Amino acid sequence: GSSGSSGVTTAIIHRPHAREQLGFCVEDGIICSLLRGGIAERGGIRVGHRIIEINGQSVVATPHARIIELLTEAYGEVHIKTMPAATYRLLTGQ
């Protein structure tokens, strides 16, 4: 691609199996720890960043509980949109 708007980080997780862990630990819609040598790292998951959208679904105002049910339902090609709470907030602060 040519038109690139550097801003929100987008990662892609490869979940070939359902009975397989994820590696990345999410807390209140915000990743904290990441499994070393797993998928998250491969896809593009980085702790500290907050989740605002998943599999094409706005979860910025969605309760973790649900977020989990969603991500889980999404297998194989999972699109997780990560964003730094700092920037996001500052953006939607005005």
From Swiss-Prot:
Which top-rank group of organisms is this from? Eukaryota
**Coiled-coil ranges (or none):** none
Q: Which residues form the PDZ domain?
A: 10-85
The tissues in which it is expressed are: Expressed in all tissues examined with lower levels in brain and testis.
Q: Name the residues that span the membrane.
A: none
In which compartments does the protein localize?
Cytoplasm, Perinuclear region
| Description of its domains | Composed of an N-terminal domain, a middle phosphotyrosine-binding domain (PID/PTB) that mediates binding with the cytoplasmic domain of the amyloid-beta precursor protein, and two C-terminal PDZ domains thought to attach proteins to the plasma membrane.
- What does the subunit comment say? Binds to the cytoplasmic domain of amyloid protein (APP) in vivo. Interacts with HIF1AN (via N-terminus). Interacts with NECAB3; seems to mediate the interaction between NECAB3 and HIF1AN.
Q: What does this protein do?
A: May modulate processing of the amyloid-beta precursor protein (APP) and hence formation of APP-beta. May enhance the activity of HIF1A in macrophages by inhibiting the activity of HIF1AN.
- Name it: Amyloid-beta A4 precursor protein-binding family A member 3
The organism is Homo sapiens (Human)
| Organismal lineage | Eukaryota, Metazoa, Chordata, Craniata, Vertebrata
